[PDB]
Amino acid sequence: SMEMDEKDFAADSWSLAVDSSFLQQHKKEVMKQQDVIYELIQTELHHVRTLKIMTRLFRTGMLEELHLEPGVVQGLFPCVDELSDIHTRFLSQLLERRRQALCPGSTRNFVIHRLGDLLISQFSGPSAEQMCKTYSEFCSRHSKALKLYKELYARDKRFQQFIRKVTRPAVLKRHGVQECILLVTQRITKYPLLISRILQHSHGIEEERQDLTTALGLVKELLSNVDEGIYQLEKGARLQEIYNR
Amino acid sequence: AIRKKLVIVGDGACGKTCLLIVFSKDQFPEVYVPTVFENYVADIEVDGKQVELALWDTAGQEDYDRLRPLSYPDTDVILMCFSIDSPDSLENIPEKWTPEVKHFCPNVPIILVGNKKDLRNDEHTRRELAKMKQEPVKPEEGRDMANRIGAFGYMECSAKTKDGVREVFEMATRAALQA
Numbered sequence: 001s002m003e004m005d006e007k008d009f010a011a012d013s014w015s016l017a018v019d020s021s022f023l024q025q026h027k028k029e030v031m032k033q034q035d036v037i038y039e040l041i042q043t044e045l046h047h048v049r050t051l052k053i054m055t056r057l058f059r060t061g062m063l064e065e066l067h068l069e070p071g072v073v074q075g076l077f078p079c080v081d082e083l084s085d086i087h088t089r090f091l092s093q094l095l096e097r098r099r100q101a102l103c104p105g106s107t108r109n110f111v112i113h114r115l116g117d118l119l120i121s122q123f124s125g126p127s128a129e130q131m132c133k134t135y136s137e138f139c140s141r142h143s144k145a146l147k148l149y150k151e152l153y154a155r156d157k158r159f160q161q162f163i164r165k166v167t168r169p170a171v172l173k174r175h176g177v178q179e180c181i182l183l184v185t186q187r188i189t190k191y192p193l194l195i196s197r198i199l200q201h202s203h204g205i206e207e208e209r210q211d212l213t214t215a216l217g218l219v220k221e222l223l224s225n226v227d228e229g230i231y232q233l234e235k236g237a238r239l240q241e242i243y244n245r
Numbered sequence: 246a247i248r249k250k251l252v253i254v255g256d257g258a259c260g261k262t263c264l265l266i267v268f269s270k271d272q273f274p275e276v277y278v279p280t281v282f283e284n285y286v287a288d289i290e291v292d293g294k295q296v297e298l299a300l301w302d303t304a305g306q307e308d309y310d311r312l313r314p315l316s317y318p319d320t321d322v323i324l325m326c327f328s329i330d331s332p333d334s335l336e337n338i339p340e341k342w343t344p345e346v347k348h349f350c351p352n353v354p355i356i357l358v359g360n361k362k363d364l365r366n367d368e369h370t371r372r373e374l375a376k377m378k379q380e381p382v383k384p385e386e387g388r389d390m391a392n393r394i395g396a397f398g399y400m401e402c403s404a405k406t407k408d409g410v411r412e413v414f415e416m417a418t419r420a421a422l423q424a
């Protein structure tokens with residue numbers, strides 16, 4: 001992540017991020033809505049950072065330092081460039097909505113009143129089709145990536161030294177290779193939980209309540225489609241194991 | 246410090262997310278309680294042994310039967326949760342959650358955890374439950390379910406007061422270390 005966004009999302013909540021004199025101007029219901037929108041953006045920033053660790057630190061480092069057989073790095077990090085493009089674009093839109101809402105003279109005081117339309121756009125049309133295609137592919141390659149990682153760590157000395165080197169810093173404690181894969185697979189199922197709680201505190205404007213209700217339905221439709229489109233790939237799988245249960 | 250993996254499972258209303266949040270912060274949040282939990286790696290020393298215990302939640306995956314099992318590979322200990330204010334959450338343990346965990350995590354120890362123990366003697370809870378001919382889960386009902394499902398053990402906690410939370414995760418670490 002870049003320092004400007006890390007500092008903007010350093011606080012544990014929106015109520016602790018804004019100036020106390022600005023917080024005191026809002027009703028409790030507005031504060032509750034903004035605290036959940038802030039958690040959605042803060043966790044999206046961290047999710048994009050997980051994808052950057054996968055691409056910039058692990059994938060790039062292996063291509064630059066190690067002598068792996070072709071197709072091995074793509075096997076460890078399936079779809080990571082496509083996932084990075086999807087979420088960096090979504091994060092850019094969330095951060096632009098926040099930046100437009102800032103009060104003049106402030107870099108921290110804002111209220112986002114119109115999130116629903118941005119969520120409908122993200123979870124409909126071509127961007128939803130790309131999210132469905134990419135997660136159906138990623139989640140079907142999840143088991144294979146974990147098994148390939150375990151095999152390389154146990155048999156290749158230069159690989160084990162590389163992993164121990166790049167994962168040594170305390171800031172990577174929660175972000176080993178297997179941990180990044182599961183953080184990415186679990187991201188999509190956090191969206192309904194966050195949207196439903198934002199919706200609970202968005203009844204003040206009926207158009208906003210309707211837009212968040214539409215967005216929640218679209219996110220659940222995407223999750224149902226991804227879940228129905230998964231079957232784990234396995235290295236050395238025989239056709240007979242595939243067409244039999 | 247050896248690395249071990251813990252996964253918590255249970256119905257949407259069992260309190261699993263709150264339990265992971267309170268343990269990872271050693272505090273019930275005073276200003277904002279998070280909606281979701283990403284992951285965390287706790288440094289735990291139990292009975293003289295140092296462990297890095299990675300913690301994972303399955304909240305949000307309950308309706309997705311092909312996504313949910315992706316949380317299980319190489320789990321060392323399962324916390325199987327129910328809420329003491331919800332006899333319905335305890336009823337879903339033996340024939341929904343238990344056969345799933347036994348299939349995807351063979352031979353992994355399961356600790357059955359009764360969450361929200363502070364509501365067992367709460368008047369509002371007893372009134373709401375009585376309308377459905379129900380009452381808070383009794384400790385013997387929790388122990389008997391743990392016994393029946395083949396659990397490593399039965400424990401209770403309250404994320405609200407923090408009582409029993411440290412003990413649950415220290416015992417999960419001991420279970421993860423057993424051969």
Ligand SMILES: Cc1cc(Cn2nc(C)ccc2=O)on1
Pocket residue numbers: 230231241242243244245
């Ligand atoms: C590849 C692939 C396999 C399946 C699931 N499956 N489908 C059938 C029809 C038979 C066996 C069986 O396992 O889904 N994708």
Ligand SMILES: Cc1cc(Cn2nc(C)ccc2=O)on1
Pocket residue numbers: 340341342344345346348
């Ligand atoms: C094999 C297998 C078993 C299960 C989990 N499960 N199995 C049954 C029979 C009933 C409920 C239930 O949750 O998932 N895969």
Ligand SMILES: Cc1cc(Cn2nc(C)ccc2=O)on1
Pocket residue numbers: 365381382383384
């Ligand atoms: C139901 C119920 C349980 C008890 C007695 N009791 N037992 C324990 C282990 C914890 C709290 C506690 O109140 O009394 N009624």
